[PDB]
Amino acid sequence: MKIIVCITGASGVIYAKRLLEVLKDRAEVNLIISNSAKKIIKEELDIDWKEIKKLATDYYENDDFFSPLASGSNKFDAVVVVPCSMKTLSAIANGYSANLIVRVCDIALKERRKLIIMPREMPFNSIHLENMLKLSNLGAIVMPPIPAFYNKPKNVNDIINFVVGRVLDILGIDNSLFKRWGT
Amino acid sequence: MKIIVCITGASGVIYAKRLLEVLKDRAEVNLIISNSAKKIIKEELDIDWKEIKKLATDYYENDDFFSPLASGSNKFDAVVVVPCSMKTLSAIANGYSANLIVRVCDIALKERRKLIIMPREMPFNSIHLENMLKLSNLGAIVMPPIPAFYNKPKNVNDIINFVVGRVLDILGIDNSLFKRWGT
Amino acid sequence: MKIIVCITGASGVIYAKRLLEVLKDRAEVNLIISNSAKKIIKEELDIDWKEIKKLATDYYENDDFFSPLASGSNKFDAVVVVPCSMKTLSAIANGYSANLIVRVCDIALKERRKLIIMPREMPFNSIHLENMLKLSNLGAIVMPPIPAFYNKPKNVNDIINFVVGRVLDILGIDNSLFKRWGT
Amino acid sequence: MKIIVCITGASGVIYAKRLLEVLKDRAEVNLIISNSAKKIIKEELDIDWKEIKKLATDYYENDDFFSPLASGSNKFDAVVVVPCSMKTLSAIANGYSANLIVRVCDIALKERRKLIIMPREMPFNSIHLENMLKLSNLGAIVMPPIPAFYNKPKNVNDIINFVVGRVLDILGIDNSLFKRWGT
Amino acid sequence: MKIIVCITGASGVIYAKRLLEVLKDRAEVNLIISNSAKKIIKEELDIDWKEIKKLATDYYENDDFFSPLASGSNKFDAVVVVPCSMKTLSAIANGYSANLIVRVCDIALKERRKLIIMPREMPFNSIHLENMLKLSNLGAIVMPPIPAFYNKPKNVNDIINFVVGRVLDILGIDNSLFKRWGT
Amino acid sequence: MKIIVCITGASGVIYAKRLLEVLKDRAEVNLIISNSAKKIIKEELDIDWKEIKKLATDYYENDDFFSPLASGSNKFDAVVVVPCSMKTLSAIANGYSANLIVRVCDIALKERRKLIIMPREMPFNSIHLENMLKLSNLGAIVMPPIPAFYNKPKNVNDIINFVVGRVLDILGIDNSLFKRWGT
Amino acid sequence: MKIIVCITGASGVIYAKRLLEVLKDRAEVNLIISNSAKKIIKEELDIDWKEIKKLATDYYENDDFFSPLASGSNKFDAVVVVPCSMKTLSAIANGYSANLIVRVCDIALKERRKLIIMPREMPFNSIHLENMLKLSNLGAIVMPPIPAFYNKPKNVNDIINFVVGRVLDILGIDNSLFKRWGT
Amino acid sequence: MKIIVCITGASGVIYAKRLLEVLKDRAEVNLIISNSAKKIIKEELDIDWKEIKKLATDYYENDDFFSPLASGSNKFDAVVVVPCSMKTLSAIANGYSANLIVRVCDIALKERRKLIIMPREMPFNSIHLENMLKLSNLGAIVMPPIPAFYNKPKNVNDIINFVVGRVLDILGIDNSLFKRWGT
Amino acid sequence: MKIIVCITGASGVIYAKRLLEVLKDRAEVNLIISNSAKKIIKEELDIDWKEIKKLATDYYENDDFFSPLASGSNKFDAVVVVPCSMKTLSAIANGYSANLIVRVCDIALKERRKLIIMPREMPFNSIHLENMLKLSNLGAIVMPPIPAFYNKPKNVNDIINFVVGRVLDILGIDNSLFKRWGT
Ligand SMILES: Cc1cc2nc3c(=O)[nH]c(=O)nc-3n(C[C@H](O)[C@H](O)[C@H](O)COP(=O)(O)O)c2cc1C
Ligand SMILES: Cc1cc2nc3c(=O)[nH]c(=O)nc-3n(C[C@H](O)[C@H](O)[C@H](O)COP(=O)(O)O)c2cc1C
Ligand SMILES: Cc1cc2nc3c(=O)[nH]c(=O)nc-3n(C[C@H](O)[C@H](O)[C@H](O)COP(=O)(O)O)c2cc1C
Ligand SMILES: Cc1cc2nc3c(=O)[nH]c(=O)nc-3n(C[C@H](O)[C@H](O)[C@H](O)COP(=O)(O)O)c2cc1C
Ligand SMILES: Cc1cc2nc3c(=O)[nH]c(=O)nc-3n(C[C@H](O)[C@H](O)[C@H](O)COP(=O)(O)O)c2cc1C
Ligand SMILES: Cc1cc2nc3c(=O)[nH]c(=O)nc-3n(C[C@H](O)[C@H](O)[C@H](O)COP(=O)(O)O)c2cc1C
Ligand SMILES: Cc1cc2nc3c(=O)[nH]c(=O)nc-3n(C[C@H](O)[C@H](O)[C@H](O)COP(=O)(O)O)c2cc1C
Ligand SMILES: Cc1cc2nc3c(=O)[nH]c(=O)nc-3n(C[C@H](O)[C@H](O)[C@H](O)COP(=O)(O)O)c2cc1C
Ligand SMILES: Cc1cc2nc3c(=O)[nH]c(=O)nc-3n(C[C@H](O)[C@H](O)[C@H](O)COP(=O)(O)O)c2cc1C
């Protein structure tokens, strides 16, 4: 399974870090990190962004349009935008593929490949909601990171693993990352 | 400030508990708890629902339409639906005021009083998103509990206090519940 | 009163200069100037852009996302985009917060803070008009600089002071910058 | 070139006066002045409205439906509504041809003749914007008088000549009324 | 508090009379009465319309566009159209400010001032309902005079005072004009 | 059968004259003639408008809102607007009942009585077509006078009788005014 | 000027006959006649359809897709569908180019050439009106044959010449076929 | 894999010929050729249409509704309409299953089977674009034959093989028909 | 004839090269090449981008907003975006004039000058199709490079000359670049 993981400049890049490590030995992972996300990884995770780069089977710069990912002639199974900034949510919904992340999302939509986006914002305004609705109407899986608590998390890590486990659920990847509802 | 806190049957009732206690001595709080939320409080917080009832200046049953809240002739400043189930999100968006919670939301909209809803679901489908968009277009503040991490939470409690602090921000209530972006 | 003044690359930056000086001692003013507007200030006002920078209580670069303004956790009262380019009008209407100006407009909309935009173009096409209509429908005050003449302006300065006085009117700031209709 | 100039009751009738005199010897000009505009000409230009009447090759009263203009069987090249009141903008957008001005605009639309409207209002509300969008979508040129300043106006007259020069530009009439962008 | 009371030609002008007298010493009231409403006041209240004129701090004729109210440069707090004819409901919804009443409603919408309309008709058709929906979507308070009976009215006067008390409620004016729901 | 015949200022008032005389002894006919139609009757039929007035069982001035027709409490079976000007088509579609004709059309729609309109214009623009579509969607019978020729008309009179016969067909009135398709 | 005249199966083919003869020596006319129109020409004009065929510079069968007209690579100035059946109005509006007539209309729309349609039906339903509105919105000239009477027609021929003269007006062809409004 | 290949009357039937031969020994292919496409195969490929018929595992006439394909009770995996005429694009988008091709497309949509359409036209008008948008919104893969050149085609054959290879890509059929982007 | 040729980063820049050379001595050509297109010219045409620069009467950098083209006060006859990337298609449709190419397209739309766009993508998704539909609805000529084969191309060059000949057709430029349908 070939999964494109796209990190954009919004709070909660810890979700992307955890997803990348639970995917390490279970899927071919291509990684793209926007310039804004590089600064957020540094600020929120107190590690340099290149530390995230090594958890993927391949990495491409967000401005490297000569990447093989930038064409529908090349194939992949799924895209995960985690977290998804409001800027990138807008670009995906309107087709403004000015970087590699939005280009591979636009490719996923035209080639009918699975597209998961995790918009992180609070509150949402009507522009965010309409951009999400449009993409959901086109078959994208709109999945803002909204933890539940029926698994009774004991720490931050339990919350992160719930969100990531649900992402793997949507990807069709079996996991036991969280205590499910039936316990 | 008179605030109506409405707890519906969705995961994350811990947000409602924390909001009620930080509001205890700062606002007149009226509380409504749906039957489904009573079971979720018991399951997720391992306390009986009547323990939540005592944190409010007033309580009304979700089926008590003779409550003073059930009429626009009586006044309040804000409604907070936390967490907001998809069922109640649907009812508010379509005006199906079959219980007291949806009735006071419908009152808030016709009387132009502040309405905050916190829909808790993951992923969202297009029905959820359109119901949220409609309500946001009418002036409701659509605020799913989506924690950020730039405050670097050290525990579950730091995550809950971020979400609740943002709710107080929207209510216009000064608080220091979380480390803000400028630190 | 904390007002964010955003200057974008469209003709009529003299409006922004006049607004900044009548606001100098009456409000806490944060200023953002886009790169395009820096060139227009130089071309139309024959002064370097840093001369405008000093009229504000604070300045932030349009690419400084680490500015405190870039988060809803921090507070302000109003945003004024003067003048508003068609590019920035598009970005605000579609949520493409790729710079600090659009990000604080998007924040204003989600946090329900006052947003004033002054699109400067002639003629308008249907894309401009639909972008303005959408934002007006969301509660933004869409205010292209369209001077009136019932005050009988004697010079360019009287025209600029009419437009700026109307902006202060919308902000709720008492002023006598122009001869009102009742004279 | 036969141009219908329609003056309605909104501020800025000086634009109509200047347009009429630069058109004097370059086009066959038919003029209509609404009753409200007659009062505004008097108040803003301190001249009687009949002084404007003499600058046209023909004049018709706004209630003279027996005018030849009131039928599509008769021909013209363009209509200019300057300035355009919000009332007349509404009437044109909804087809309420209760006077000669709106009737010749409705004729222009059905006969596919050029229609220019210059709505003068500040701010615009959503009703104005939707009425303009509808007309722009039908091929009308929606042109609120929004002066630019890259020509560095030295006086009110330079501002008026910029707006009027742009109107002549849209009409296809060569002019040197303003210093263009390339200088 | 400066309130514009606008009486249009629909049945139920008794509501406007009662509102004007309960507002007499509690707000600065400007009054406009349409020609049709003058005849309805005479027919339904068996008093000459000038008897209503004296209950206001100021009066303006519906055709007096030189009134200070006819410009956004002048300020007011709220407009109440009571009762609102279907003709005037249409004009407000479509922006056809052909008289002073609709002009001050259009001003209220562009200046974001409170607008209350009380359309009186039975039944409503789809044109009425869409005109009301549009205005409600723009933030107007659409308030047809629909008395309730939980206050157990003993006479016509109790019904009129309920409707008027609710109008004062929306205006933010404290009153005891009716027995509220909580009794 | 009580039929309201409304003549508005558009070409083809001969249709209204012929309809009124074929209805003379077969239905109770109430007649309203707009001021514009009075001039068109004079110009196109070379007879004074009062000659048309005598063919009806009752006549009311277009500004006589005290007419019994102006209330839904009074009853009628059908309204025929023949011919229908574009101005009146607009007013009916938008609910702008500023005269008795549009008021009785609006009454017909709310009371669910039969409404026939015969818009006379050529070509139609998109505003006309949308106004007709809206009214047709509400159940009005939109019937521009478009003669057919399968009856092989020998003179103008045969064309007028075809159009009028079709109107009687829609009214449910048996007639032999034209040679039907089956001959 | 190269004009495509398309006759479809609706009443009023006399309009097409008259248009073809007034165009004989003033434009290059290509003619297409549908099978249904061939029967209507015979029934309504009591002449064989081949009599109409000779009035054109070229004729093509409605099923001859190898005609040069059937490609946008070949050029023409205008299409006139007279009369336009409801079936063909539907096909044009929905793009169902199953014959040569609809194909050249679809070509006219993609190549931005003038398209005139004359739908003949009475009354219209909402399907007709929406099909006309869509085409008018795309720039087609929607022109049902609706004669006026201000020219005071003395016979059927005067009515036919009014309609045809208006068609030539829209085509930009000078004519004196009817007494215009200014007489 | 059972694939229905449908050839309609538009230029570029060479794409259908090439697709049929690369599919010969890799899938069960059912073929339908419209009458118009039979003429285009003859004109553009200078071979009789029956030469194309032999490349399929089964053939059915476009009017043979007794074909097993004409019912959803029978199964297939994918439909490819190559090339897709504007007429057939319209019929599919509107559900006008008047032949076997459109019927199996309508079946594919109701049974949720893969539907690929390749509309061939240049330019497109708004009717084409809306018909494509509607079908794309329903899950059809809208794929006009638009060759790329990053594979550096050396001849017409390289262009045809790129388009066909992309079709096989969408079908999930591995192929090396073109030099992919990563070379 | 002044034509703006805009090359954006999509496959098929050979179309732009061929169009520029057939336009060399027949029109005043202004050229803009985006940074992405510069790389694609190098990769697909194996020539440096400056080789394309010399075929135009003028060249401007895509970031040179001080170019005379960047203002509506300066005039041109037509814009051709060939090829049009999905990113630039999005920007034009939404008005995001962040570079000179989109700015001159936005100018073309407001000044009602001819705009031709040639989006190159396969397949299209619903975002592409809606962006094209919107622009086509505004009067842009949406012309993806979709070659036909009725001219029986013998080589790649014949395909390129068909597409370019059709572009000249839309521009109103006589050419014999391809064998037309009538041969
Ligand atoms: C510390 C920080 C946190 C941010 N958090 C968010 C966020 O949570 N949601 C959001 O939409 N934007 C957020 N932003 C702003 C975005 O980073 C900004 O819009 C940026 O342009 C996104 O670009 P990208 O999608 O290419 O990463 C944040 C910015 C900073 C500096
Ligand atoms: C343990 C549990 C957790 C649930 N969590 C959610 C949830 O997170 N979001 C949601 O929409 N519904 C959730 N539901 C289902 C809702 O409770 C259900 O739709 C209910 O009818 C809501 O009614 P109420 O809004 O009146 O409380 C949950 C149900 C259970 C038993
Ligand atoms: C001298 C000059 C004047 C301009 N005037 C306008 C204008 O009046 N309206 C507009 O929409 N764009 C105008 N532009 C183009 C914008 O500056 C351009 O779209 C830019 O990208 C806007 O970016 P910004 O909003 O970040 O400032 C002008 C450009 C120049 C060089
Ligand atoms: C002094 C004065 C200035 C006005 N200015 C405007 C204006 O700038 N914009 C506007 O929409 N209406 C304005 N109005 C109100 C309009 O004149 C009013 O709506 C009138 O009915 C327009 O009618 P008309 O379009 O037939 O001229 C103004 C009125 C007055 C008395
Ligand atoms: C006695 C009487 C009662 C009326 N009642 C109503 C009414 O209740 N609702 C309504 O929409 N129109 C009613 N009308 C008709 C309106 O007065 C008419 O449409 C008028 O043009 C409204 O104009 P205005 O809004 O400027 O007052 C009534 C008319 C009369 C004579
Ligand atoms: C001689 C003459 C003929 C007219 N013919 C038409 C017409 O055929 N269609 C139309 O919409 N307006 C026509 N008009 C204009 C209308 O009369 C005008 O819009 C008027 O305001 C209609 O008002 P009413 O509907 O109250 O009669 C004509 C005007 C004149 C003077
Ligand atoms: C005598 C006769 C008259 C007709 N008149 C009309 C008409 O006036 N309007 C219409 O829409 N259809 C009319 N029809 C039906 C159309 O001819 C029918 O829908 C036909 O399929 C149109 O096909 P065409 O557009 O290819 O000519 C008439 C049919 C007949 C036999
Ligand atoms: C030589 C020729 C080429 C054609 N090319 C096209 C084309 O490229 N696109 C199109 O929409 N129609 C084209 N047509 C017209 C269609 O064949 C026509 O609309 C036909 O009815 C389609 O029917 P079908 O889809 O059942 O094959 C062409 C016609 C001919 C004769
Ligand atoms: C080799 C190559 C080929 C590309 N082909 C296309 C294409 O055919 N269609 C498309 O939409 N984008 C294509 N792209 C991606 C665009 O270049 C990218 O979205 C870019 O940002 C467009 O920017 P521009 O419009 O300013 O040139 C291609 C990229 C590369 C590297």
UniProtKB/Swiss-Prot annotation, chains A, B, C, D, E, F, G, H, I:
InterPro entries: Flavin_trans-like (IPR036551), Flavoprotein (IPR003382), UbiX-like (IPR004507). The keyword Transferase applies. It catalyses: dimethylallyl phosphate + FMNH2 = prenylated FMNH2 + phosphate. Dimethylallyl phosphate binds at Y150, R166. Its EC number is 2.5.1.129. Keywords: Flavoprotein, FMN, Prenyltransferase, Transferase. Flavin prenyltransferase that catalyzes the synthesis of the prenylated FMN cofactor (prenyl-FMN) for 4-hydroxy-3-polyprenylbenzoic acid decarboxylase UbiD. The prenyltransferase is metal-independent and links a dimethylallyl moiety from dimethylallyl monophosphate (DMAP) to the flavin N5 and C6 atoms of FMN. GO terms for molecular function: carboxy-lyase activity; flavin prenyltransferase activity. FMN binds at G9, A10, S11, S34, S85, M86, K87, T88, R120. Pfam families: Flavoprotein. Belongs to the UbiX/PAD1 family. This is Flavin prenyltransferase UbiX.
